[PDB]
Amino acid sequence: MQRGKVKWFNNEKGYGFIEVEGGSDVFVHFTAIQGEGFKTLEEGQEVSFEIVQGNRGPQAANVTKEA
Amino acid sequence: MQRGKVKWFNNEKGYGFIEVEGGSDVFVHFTAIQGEGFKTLEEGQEVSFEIVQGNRGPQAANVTKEA
């Protein structure tokens, strides 16, 4: 796992980027968002996630909102 | 994105394998399952999925139960 903050998230398109502690921004698709809530994220929201390597490069998997 | 069928899934533990015609089985964790509803899958279930490579190797992402 890794911790980061949502840089931006567009809930109409369903994706955004997560800014991380010392590395490139990580892409985040709505399909990775955990929880029963609507699968959206807010700019600035802290999230815990795992970095996975998808066919277009790095991606967020298992994205959870931290309290 | 591609289709496959659930080979087996352990409901208590929340993981299983997707069998792909002509290819290798793909590990699937409950966290990748899309939809509203309890995150589980039955053997024989047709699914669509993406494949990503994490710290543990290849695994399914964006798993949707298909009819």
Q: Which residues pair with A63 in a beta bridge?
A: A33
Task: Tell me whether A39 touches chain B (CB under 8 Å).
Answer: no
For A27-50, give one letter per residue: b (16+ CB within 10 A) or e: bbbbbbbbeeeebebeeebebebb
**Experimental method of this PDB entry:** X-ray
Chain B residues near residue A62 by CB distance under 8 angstroms: 31
Lookup: tokens for A21: 């502690």
CA dist., res. B54 & res. A52, Å (int): 4
Q: How far apart are the first and last CA of chain A?
A: 16
| Class level of CATH domain A1-67 | mainly beta
CA dist., res. B33 & res. B65, Å (int): 8
Out of A29, A34, A52, closest to residue B54 by CB: A52
CA dist., res. B52 & res. A52, Å (int): 6
What Cα–Cα distance (Å) separates residue B27 from each residue in A4, A14, A41, A44, B14?
A: 26, 25, 27, 33, 11
Whether B54 sits inside 8 A of A31 (CB atoms) is: no
Neighbours of B37 (CB within 10 A): 9
CB A16 within 8 A of CB A28: yes
Nearest to A49 by CA among B3, B11, A36, A27: A27
Q: How far is A7 from chain B (nearest CA, A)?
A: 22
